[PDB]
C-alpha cells in the first residue's frame, strides 16, 4: 500500500563559533536510510540502512555534492533572512527544509511536498499543485516573488514527480525484505491501583512496523475515550515502535474494559482484557 | 549600476623571467572569482579560482601562476617567472555564489600578455595612409582610403580614423586581428589594415583632413633599454592625407 | 566525466538566414545548468542564456532560440534573420556541483560564426592606391566583390572586411591583377 520518501534538512547559525551546522536525514516510510553532518570528519553522505549500502560510489558522490550545495545555500539564506527580519548577528537561528513524495499501491505519484521554516515557524510552502507557493509573513513574500520569477516550483515538481518517485521505487524493491514487510504489535496489559476506589489499566503494543497504530478502549462493548490517555509512539531503536493506551476504571470493574489494537500487519484487530 | 569584472592591464609585454600581477576587482559582491586563459584551439582553461575571501585553489593549468584573495573584492594573478608559454589572453571572472547556483560566470575585458625571449624584437608600427583610386571615384562616386600599420610586435594596437579633428566610425572597416608578416615565426611581427569610405565630393574637398591613428602598447618606462633606435614604448603613430581634386 | 563538445570549429551563413550551432554535453550529474556565451571580435564574453536541467525544450529571447534534448544530450543554438552583427565566436558550457558544493564550469572549445552580407549588385573591381607621403609605396583594393568569393608569395593579403560592401587589401615590396587568385 501507499509509501513515502522524505528528506529533512536542518541549518543552525553559530555566530563567531564558525560556519552554520547542517544535518540532512532521508526516510523511506518510517525507516531512515541516509544522513549528512557538516561537523562529521566523514564529509560525505553516509548509509544508515543495510539496503542502501549496495549503491555504488557514484551514487554517494552525487548525493554528497548536491546536499553540500544546499548546505551552502542554507548558509547564505540564514544571513538573507536575518537581513529580512532585521535581527542582530549575536543570535542563533534555524532554517528547516522538509520535502519528498508519496506513491500509491500502484507505484504512481500521489503527492509532493517542499516546506521551509525559520525559527520553527512555517516560512514558505509549495502548494499541492506543485506550481505555486504559500508565504507565512512579509519576509517570505519577497522569497515568493523571487521564486515565482525564477520558476523554482518547476524545479521541485520535476524532482517530486520525477526522480523522487523513480528512486522511492528502487529503494522499496532493493530493500523490500525490510520496507514492505510488517511486524505485528506484540501486546500485553498492566494494572496499578491508584486509589482505594480507582485503578489504571495500561494496554501495551511492542515491536511493530510501520508506526501507524490505533489503540482504543471499550466498556461492555461500547467505545470509551473518557478517562483514557495515548502516549506518543516512540522508537525502540531496532527499527520497531512502541505505544500504550491507559484508561482509569473503578476498582473491581476491570473485566468490563477491553483494549482494541488495529495495525497494518493484523488480519483481524487484536483484543485484550486484564487477567490477574 | 555596477562596473562588473574590472581587470588591468589591458596589455603587457615581458622579457622571459620577469614578473607581473594581473589585478581583477568586482563591485557585484560575488563570492567566487576565477582566472582563465584563452588560446587558439584550447578555449578556456581555468588557472586558479576562489570561493571566498582567503581561499585560493588550483584549476586545470596552475603551473607557473600563483594567486591571492586577501579581500572578496579582488583576485591577483602572479607570474613570478614569465615563460613564452604564458603569452595568452587572460580573463578574470566572478559568480554570485550559493545564494544563486544558477548564476553564470561574469567575465572581464581580458589582459593580452606577450612574453618574449628579448625586448629587442619589440617594434612600434609604421603607419601610412594610401589615397583613393581616381578609377573608384568616376566609377562608384565614392572614395576608399586605406591605412596600413606594419612591422609592429607585439600584436597590441588599436586603430582609429580621425576626420577634421573628430574620431569617426561610419564608413570604417578594420581587420578583426593583426595578421603575421611571417606566419612560420613564433617571434613574427604584424600588420593591420583599415578602410574609410567617403562620398568622392567629401574626399575631393581639400578642407578635409584624414588621419589614420594606431595606439601601440609596448615597453613601460621601467624596462631598461640599450639600443640606438628609440625605446619602443606605448605610443601613437599616425599617418595623414588631405583632400585632392 | 565532465565534457562539452562543439564539433563545429568554423561555419559561415549569408545574412537574413537561420543558422544552428550544435553543442553536446556529457555528464552523470543530474542537477546541471547549460549556458551559451557570445564572444564578438571585440573579445569580451557575454552571457546569452541559461538552461536548467528541469527546464523545457525550446527557450526564445528575441531572434535567439535554443533546443534542449536530454535524450540527445544536446543544446543546439539557433539565430533567425542573421545580421552581420551576429558574426562572433560562440561558447557552449555546463555547470555542476563540485566537491565543496560550489557550481563550476566546463566550456566547449567554441564555434566561429561568420555572417557574410548579401551583395545585390556585385560590382567586383581592383584599384591601385598611392601612399600620400610620396613614398612611391602602394596597395591594391579588391572591393564590391561577391560575399561567395573568398581567396587569399611575399604578397600579404588580408581577410575580407564588411563595411554595405566587401573589401580585401593586398600589398608587397616589388602586380595588383594576378593577386587574389
Amino acid at each position: 500500500g501507499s509509501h513515502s520518501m522524505r528528506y529533512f534538512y536542518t541549518s543552525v547559525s553559530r555566530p563567531g563559533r564558525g560556519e552554520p551546522r547542517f544535518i540532512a536525514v532521508g526516510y523511506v516510510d518510517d525507516t531512515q536510510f541516509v544522513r549528512f553532518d557538516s561537523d562529521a570528519a566523514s564529509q560525505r553522505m553516509e548509509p544508515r540502512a543495510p539496503w542502501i549500502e549496495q549503491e555504488g560510489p557514484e551514487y554517494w558522490d552525487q548525493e554528497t555534492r548536491n546536499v553540500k550545495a544546499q548546505s551552502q545555500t542554507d548558509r547564505v539564506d540564514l544571513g538573507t533572512l536575518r537581513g529580512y527580519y532585521n535581527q542582530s548577528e549575536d543570535g542563533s537561528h534555524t532554517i528547516q527544509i522538509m520535502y519528498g513524495c508519496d506513491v500509491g499501491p500502484d507505484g504512481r505519484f500521489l503527492r509532493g511536498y517542499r516546506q521551509d521554516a525559520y525559527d520553527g515557524k512555517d516560512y514558505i510552502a509549495l502548494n499541492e499543485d506543485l506550481r505555486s507557493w504559500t508565504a507565512a509573513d512579509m519576509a517570505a513574500q519577497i522569497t515568493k516573488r523571487k521564486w515565482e520569477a525564477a520558476h523554482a516550483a518547476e524545479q521541485q515538481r520535476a524532482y517530486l514527480e520525477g526522480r523522487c518517485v523513480e528512486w522511492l521505487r528502487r529503494y522499496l524493491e532493493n530493500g523490500k525484505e525490510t520496507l514492505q514487510r510488517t511486524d505485528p504489535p506484540k501486546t500485553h496489559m498492566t494494572h496499578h491501583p491508584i486509589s482505594d476506589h480507582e485503578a489504571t489499566l495500561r494496554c501495551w503494543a511492542l515491536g511493530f512496523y510501520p508506526a501507524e497504530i490505533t489503540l482504543t478502549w471499550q466498556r461492555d462493548g461500547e467505545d470509551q475515550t473518557q478517562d483514557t490517555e495515548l502516549v506518543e509512539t516512540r522508537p525502540a531503536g531496532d527499527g520497531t515502535f512502541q505505544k500504550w493506551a491507559a484508561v482509569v476504571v473503578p476498582s473491581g470493574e476491570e473485566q468490563r474494559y477491553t483494549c482494541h489494537v488495529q495495525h497494518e500487519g493484523l488480519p483481524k484487530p487484536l483484543t485484550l482484557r486484564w487477567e490477574p | 549600476m555596477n562596473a562588473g569584472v574590472t581587470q588591468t592591464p589591458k596589455f603587457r609585454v615581458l622579457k622571459t623571467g620577469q614578473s607581473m600581477t594581473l589585478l581583477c576587482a568586482q563591485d557585484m559582491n560575488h563570492e567566487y572569482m576565477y582566472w582563465y586563459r584563452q588560446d587558439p584551439g584550447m578555449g578556456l582553461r581555468l588557472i586558479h579560482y576562489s570561493v571566498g575571501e582567503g581561499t585560493t585553489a588550483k584549476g586545470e593549468v596552475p603551473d607557473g601562476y600563483n594567486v591571492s584573495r586577501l579581500k572578496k573584492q579582488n583576485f591577483l594573478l602572479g607570474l613570478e617567472s614569465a615563460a613564452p608559454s604564458q603569452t595568452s589572453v587572460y580573463f578574470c571572472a566572478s559568480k554570485v555564489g550559493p545564494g544563486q547556483h544558477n548564476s553564470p560566470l561574469h567575465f572581464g575585458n581580458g589582459t593580452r600578455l606577450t612574453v618574449t625571449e628579448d625586448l629587442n624584437k619589440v617594434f612600434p608600427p609604421e603607419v601610412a595612409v594610401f589615397e583613393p583610386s581616381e578609377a573608384e571615384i568616376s566609377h562608384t562616386q565614392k572614395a576608399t582610403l586605406v591605412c596600413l600599420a606594419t612591422g609592429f610586435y607585439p600584436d597590441h594596437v588599436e586603430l582609429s580614423w580621425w576626420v577634421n579633428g573628430k574620431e569617426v566610425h561610419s564608413g570604417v572597416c578594420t581587420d578583426p586581428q593583426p595578421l603575421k608578416e611571417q606566419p612560420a615565426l613564433n617571434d613574427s611581427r604584424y600588420a593591420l589594415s583599415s578602410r574609410l569610405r567617403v562620398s568622392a565630393t567629401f574626399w575631393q574637398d581639400p578642407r578635409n583632413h584624414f588621419r589614420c591613428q594606431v595606439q601601440f602598447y609596448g615597453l613601460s618606462e621601467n624596462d631598461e633599454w640599450t639600443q640606438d633606435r628609440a625605446k619602443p614604448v606605448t605610443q601613437i603613430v599616425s599617418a595623414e592625407a588631405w583632400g585632392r581634386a | 566525466a565532465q565534457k562539452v563538445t562543439q564539433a563545429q570549429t568554423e561555419i559561415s551563413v549569408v545574412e537574413k538566414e537561420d543558422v544552428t550551432l550544435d553543442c553536446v554535453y556529457e555528464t552523470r550529474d543530474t542537477a546541471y545548468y547549460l549556458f551559451w556565451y557570445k564572444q564578438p571580435p571585440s573579445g569580451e564574453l557575454v552571457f546569452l542564456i541559461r538552461q536548467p536541467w528541469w527546464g523545457e525544450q525550446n527557450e526564445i529571447s528575441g531572434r535567439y532560440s535554443w533546443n534542449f534534448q536530454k535524450s540527445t544530450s544536446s543544446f543546439n543554438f539557433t539565430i533567425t534573420a542573421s545580421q552581420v552583427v551576429d558574426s562572433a565566436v560562440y561558447f557552449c558550457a555546463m555547470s555542476v556541483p563540485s566537491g565543496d558544493g560550489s557550481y563550476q564550469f566546463t566550456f566547449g572549445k567554441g564555434t566561429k560564426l561568420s555572417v557574410i552580407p548579401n551583395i545585390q549588385n556585385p560590382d567586383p573591381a581592383v584599384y591601385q592606391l598611392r601612399d600620400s607621403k610620396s613614398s612611391d609605396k602602394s596597395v591594391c583594393l579588391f572591393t564590391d566583390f561577391d560575399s561567395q568569393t573568398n581567396v587569399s608569395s611575399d604578397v600579404y593579403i588580408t581577410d575580407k572586411c564588411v563595411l554595405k560592401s566587401n573589401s580585401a587589401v593586398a600589398w608587397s615590396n616589388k602586380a595588383c591583377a594576378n593577386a587574389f587568385n
Partner: peptide, 10 residues
C-alpha cells in the same frame, strides 16, 4: 536521492 540544490535561495 536528494533534490538538486535550490538554483536561487531565499
Amino acid at each position: 536521492v536528494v533534490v538538486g540544490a535550490d538554483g536561487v535561495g531565499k
